[PDB]
């Protein structure tokens, strides 16, 4: 009996990654693209500057 290693599965985890969303500059500061949220917005004080 011998052993084989099956190399690297980098592209394999890629094709298995078919639902993730990619993300960028990561540093200690990891940025990512779209994601929504709920924002209560109030026009408490907006003067129109020149009526």
């Amino acid at each position: 009996q011998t052993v084989v290693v099956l190399g690297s599965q980098e592209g394999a985890v890629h094709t298995a990654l078919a639902g993730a969303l990619e993300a960028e500059m990561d540093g200690a500061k990891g940025r990512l693209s779209s994601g929504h949220l709920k924002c209560r917005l109030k026009m408490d004080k907006l003067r129109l500057k020149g009526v």
């Binding site: 099956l6 599965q9 394999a12 985890v13 094709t15 298995a16 990654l17 078919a18 639902g19 993730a20 969303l21 990619e22 693209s33 779209s34 929504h36």
Partner: protein, 75 residues
């Protein structure tokens, strides 16, 4: 090393475009069509099978889908 979980079974129904949908929403069709183009006589195999189940002339095609859709992937 079966990389089992095709993540599409855990889709994120979110507005930005997902990882590889471009080829994904055709890949299973090309799967089944390639497989049957390679194993043709399995067509009439499935036919004789299904025509013997259901006995409805309407569930017959349903069992045709059954057989022609177990054959490609799980093989």
């Amino acid at each position: 090393a079966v990389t089992l979980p095709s993540h599409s079974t855990r889709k994120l129904q979110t507005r930005s475009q997902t990882w590889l949908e471009s080829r994904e929403y055709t890949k299973h069709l090309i799967r089944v069509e390639n497989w049957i183009f390679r194993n043709p006589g399995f067509a009439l195999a499935a036919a004789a099978i299904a025509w013997l189940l259901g006995s409805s002339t309407s569930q017959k095609v349903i069992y045709l889908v059954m057989i022609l859709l177990i054959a490609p992937a799980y093989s």
